Amino acid sequence: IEEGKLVIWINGDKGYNGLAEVGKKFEKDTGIKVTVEHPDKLEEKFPQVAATGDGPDIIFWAHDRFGGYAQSGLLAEITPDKAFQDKLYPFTWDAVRYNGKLIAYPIAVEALSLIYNKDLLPNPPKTWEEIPALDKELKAKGKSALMFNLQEPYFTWPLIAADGGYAFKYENGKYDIKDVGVDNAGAKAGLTFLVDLIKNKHMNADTDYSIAEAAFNKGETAMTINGPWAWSNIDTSKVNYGVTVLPTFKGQPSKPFVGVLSAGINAASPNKELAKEFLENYLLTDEGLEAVNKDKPLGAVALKSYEEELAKDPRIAATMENAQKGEIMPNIPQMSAFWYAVRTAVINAASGRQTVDEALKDAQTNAAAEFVDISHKSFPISMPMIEYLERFSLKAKINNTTNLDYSRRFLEPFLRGINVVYTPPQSFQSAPRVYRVNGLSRAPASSETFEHDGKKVTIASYFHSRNYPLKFPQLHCLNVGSSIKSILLPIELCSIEE
Ligand X SMILES: OC[C@H]1O[C@H](O[C@H]2[C@H](O)[C@@H](O)[C@@H](O)O[C@@H]2CO)[C@H](O)[C@@H](O)[C@@H]1O
Contact residues: a second copy, CB under 8 A: 98-101, 133-134, 136-137, 164, 166, 169, 172-174, 181, 186, 248, 250-253, 390, 395-397, 399
Round to whole Å and give the CA distance between 354 and 494.
42
Least spacing, CB of residue 440 vs ligand X, in Å: 49
Interface residue with ligand X among 15, 106, 125, 153 (CB under 6 A) is 153
Number of Cβ atoms within 10 Å of the Cβ of 484: 5
From residue 78, give the alpha-carbon distance in Å to each of 58, 131, 166, 427: 11, 46, 31, 35
- Which residue blocks in 157-281 are alpha helix, DSSP H? 157-162, 185-199, 209-217, 231-236, 272-278
Instruction: For 208-229, give the DSSP string.
Output: -HHHHHHHHHTT-EEEEEE-GG
Report the residue closest to Ni ion, judged by CB.
12
Q: How far apart are CA 402 and CA 472, in angstroms?
A: 8
| HSE-up (13 A, CA, CB side) for residue 302 | 31
Binder of residue 43, out of a second copy, Ni ion, ligand X, none (CB less than 5 to 8 A by kind): ligand X
Check binding of 11 to ligand X (CB under 6 A). yes
3-state secondary structure of 497: strand
Query: In the set 69, 148, 154, 414, which binds ligand X (CB under 6 A)?
Result: 154
13 makes contact with ligand X (CB under 6 A): yes
As measured in angstroms, the least distance from the Cβ of 136 to a second copy is 5
CA–CA separation, 236 and 239 (whole Å): 8
Other CB atoms within a 10 A radius of the CB of residue 86 amount to 12
CB closer to ligand X, 151 vs 441: 151
| β-pairing verdict for 257-265 and 327-328 | parallel
Which long-range contacts does 78-84 make (Cβ < 8 Å, 24+ apart)?
78/102, 78/103, 78/104, 78/105, 78/264, 78/265, 78/276, 79/276, 80/105, 80/276, 80/280, 84/280
Nearest approach, Cβ of residue 155 and ligand X (Å): 7
Closest approach, Cβ 399 to a second copy, in A, equals: 7
The span from the CA of 126 to the CA of 247, in Å, is 5
Minimal distance, residue 159 CB to ligand X, in Å: 13
> Which of a second copy, Ni ion, ligand X, none has residue 453 at its interface (CB below 5 to 8 Å by kind)?
Ni ion
Contact with ligand X (CB under 6 A) among 10, 18, 70, 110: 110
Neighbours of 485 (CB within 10 A): 6
DSSP code per residue over 453-476: TTEEEEHHHHHHHTT---S-TTSE
Q: Which is nearer to ligand X, 207 or 495 (CB)?
A: 207
Q: Which residues bind Ni ion (CB under 5 A)?
A: 12, 38, 453
Shortest distance in whole angstroms from residue 480 CB to a second copy: 27
Site for ligand X in 314-343 (CB under 6 A): 339
448 binds ligand X (CB under 6 A): no
- For a second copy, which is the closer residue by CB, 18 or 186? 186
Least gap, CB of 80 to a second copy (angstroms)? 17
Nearer to ligand X by Cβ, of 147 and 411: the residue is: 147
Query: Residue 372 or residue 484: which is nearer to a second copy going by CB?
Result: 372
Check residue 280 for interaction with ligand X (CB under 6 A). Answer: no
Q: What does the per-residue mask of binding to ligand X show for 59-98, with x meaning CB under 6 A?
A: ---x-xx---------------------------------
Binding at 62: pick from ligand X, a second copy, Ni ion, none (beta carbon under 5-8 Å per type): ligand X
- How far apart CA 333 and CA 335 sit, in angstroms, is 5
Interface with ligand X (CB under 6 A), residue total 13
Kindly tell me which of 21 and 64 has the beta carbon lying closer to ligand X.
64
Binding residues (CB under 6 A) for ligand X: these are: 11, 13, 43, 62, 64-65, 110, 152-154, 227, 259, 339
